[PDB]
Amino acid sequence: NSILLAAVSILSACQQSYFALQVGKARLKYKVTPPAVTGSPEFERVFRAQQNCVEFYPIFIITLWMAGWYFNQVFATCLGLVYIYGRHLYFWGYSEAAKKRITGFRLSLGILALLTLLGALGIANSFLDEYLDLNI
Amino acid sequence: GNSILLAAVSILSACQQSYFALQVGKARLKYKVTPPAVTGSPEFERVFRAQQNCVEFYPIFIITLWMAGWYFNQVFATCLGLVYIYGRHLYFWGYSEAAKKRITGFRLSLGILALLTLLGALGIANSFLDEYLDLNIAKK
Amino acid sequence: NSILLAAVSILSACQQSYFALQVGKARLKYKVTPPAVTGSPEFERVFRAQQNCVEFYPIFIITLWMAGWYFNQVFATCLGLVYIYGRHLYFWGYSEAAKKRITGFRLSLGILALLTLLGALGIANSFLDE
Ligand SMILES: N[C@@H](CCC(=O)N[C@@H](CS(=O)(=O)O)C(=O)NCC(=O)O)C(=O)O
Ligand SMILES: N[C@@H](CCC(=O)N[C@@H](CS(=O)(=O)O)C(=O)NCC(=O)O)C(=O)O
Numbered sequence: 001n002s003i004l005l006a007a008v009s010i011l012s013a014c015q016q017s018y019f020a021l022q023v024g025k026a027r028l029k030y031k032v033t034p035p036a037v038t039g040s041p042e043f044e045r046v047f048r049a050q051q052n053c054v055e056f057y058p059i060f061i062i063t064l065w066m067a068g069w070y071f072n073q074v075f076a077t078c079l080g081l082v083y084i085y086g087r088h089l090y091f092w093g094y095s096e097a098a099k100k101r102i103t104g105f106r107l108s109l110g111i112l113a114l115l116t117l118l119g120a121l122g123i124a125n126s127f128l129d130e131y132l133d134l135n136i
Numbered sequence: 137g138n139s140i141l142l143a144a145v146s147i148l149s150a151c152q153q154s155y156f157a158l159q160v161g162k163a164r165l166k167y168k169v170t171p172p173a174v175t176g177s178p179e180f181e182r183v184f185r186a187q188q189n190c191v192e193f194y195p196i197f198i199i200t201l202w203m204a205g206w207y208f209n210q211v212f213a214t215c216l217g218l219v220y221i222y223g224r225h226l227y228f229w230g231y232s233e234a235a236k237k238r239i240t241g242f243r244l245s246l247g248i249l250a251l252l253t254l255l256g257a258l259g260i261a262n263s264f265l266d267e268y269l270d271l272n273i274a275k276k
Numbered sequence: 277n278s279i280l281l282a283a284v285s286i287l288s289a290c291q292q293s294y295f296a297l298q299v300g301k302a303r304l305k306y307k308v309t310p311p312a313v314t315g316s317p318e319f320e321r322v323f324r325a326q327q328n329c330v331e332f333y334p335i336f337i338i339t340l341w342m343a344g345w346y347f348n349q350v351f352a353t354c355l356g357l358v359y360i361y362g363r364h365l366y367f368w369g370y371s372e373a374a375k376k377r378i379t380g381f382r383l384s385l386g387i388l389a390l391l392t393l394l395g396a397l398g399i400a401n402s403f404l405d406e
């Protein structure tokens with residue numbers, strides 16, 4: 001009963017890995033050898049890009065599964081895919097120019113804030129169903 | 137079903153995370169630090185490093201919360217969960233003001249975490265015996 | 277039954293905590309007072325080391341549980357242990373010299389990429405039966 005959620009989660013974790021590869025690729029192109037995190041405009045953008053995806057990734061996974069379990073698996077899955085796409089736009093946009101990230105960032109944050117809300121409703125909804133009412 | 141309290145704490149915790157991230161985005165405006173910069177003001181560097189610290193501990197906390205939650209007791213884990221959330225509000229806002237004023241916040245969250253870890257470990261160990269050689273001390 | 281997955285997960289989270297302690301220890305040895313993240317080669321290596329484990333940790337936990345549930349708990353558990361060990365080699369190798377992180381990194385990344393695939397199979401496998 002969590003098969004779709006699990007599918008989205010492994011994709012999402014591939015996008016994360018693939019983002020991390022791109023950063024390792026930039027350390028070669030722009031000659032930023034560890035433990036450096038600065039030394040090229042081009043590199044600083046690609047680095048901070050994924051860093052942003054890393055710091056939001058746990059938030060997304062929690063909200064995805066909580067909406068997924070407690071409200072509707074299929075809707076959460078779809079919003080999940082939208083988020084994946086939002087972060088593709090974020091990363092590649094940011095990589096080009098800092099200013100070109102916002103479209104990516106706004107839709108990712110949208111979908112997140114939405115999953116949060118659907119999760120919270122679904123949890124509240126089930127909190128009544130372990131007290132009396134199951135709203136239909 | 138069995139995890140409604142854990143799920144509640146988790147959504148709240150993930151809001152604190154988002155709310156912290158908003159505050160940093162707000163400081164990039166106040167202290168005029170445009171991406172991809174992470175430095176250029178003492179005030180901004182503290183607010184940035186603050187949540188960065190919460191980001192790097194957040195997965196640790198979620199694992200330990202659910203593992204204590206499932207394998208020991210949902211209700212105790214939930215409450216300790218709330219304590220941690222509060223501890224990190226003290227950490228972030230303390231740090232934001234002065235570096236030195238973060239410690240009370242940090243030592244709390246660390247306390248609660250290290251506790252969740254232990255309750256999780258007992259509960260997992262406890263169930264590992266009761267799937268192989270019985271572990272239940274229920275005498276009185 | 278997810279008892280073995282839960283066991284690995286708590287250990288992995290202890291390694292994470294322990295790595296974070298080591299960085300806090302380096303802020304004392306190399307006198308890097310917050311909010312600084314630079315000012316010693318020795319400190320920058322120990323800092324970037326854990327940062328790297330933090331940014332992979334959620335990836336690992338998802339892939340661990342997805343391979344664990346959807347394919348086989350016991351195989352995933354073992355690969356789990358391997359990853360833990362791989363990251364001990366990564367962190368401590370990096371801490372000494374940047375160059376001596378690679379064996380740690382290649383194996384951690386190997387096991388991850390493997391768990392990913394075992395997870396993907398196991399999900400696909402169950403998608404055919406529903
Ligand atoms: N996202 C990573 C880059 C991808 C990665 O994980 N890189 C590994 C392997 S490679 O970059 O050496 O190919 C690493 O050593 N991380 C560098 C570091 O973060 O210290 C980063 O923070 O630089
Ligand atoms: N947590 C972020 C700030 C919050 C955030 O995610 N902000 C987005 C959008 S904005 O606040 O810059 O419009 C970003 O791209 N942050 C910069 C970055 O992470 O490189 C940070 O570490 O700077």
Ligand SMILES: N[C@@H](CCC(=O)N[C@@H](CS(=O)(=O)O)C(=O)NCC(=O)O)C(=O)O
Nearest residue numbers: 185186189242296297299300303310311
């Ligand atoms: N992971 C931390 C080191 C361990 C830690 O959490 N340190 C805390 C408390 S202590 O190290 O000062 O006692 C901190 O304030 N780190 C915030 C920061 O990273 O800027 C780091 O990135 O430096």
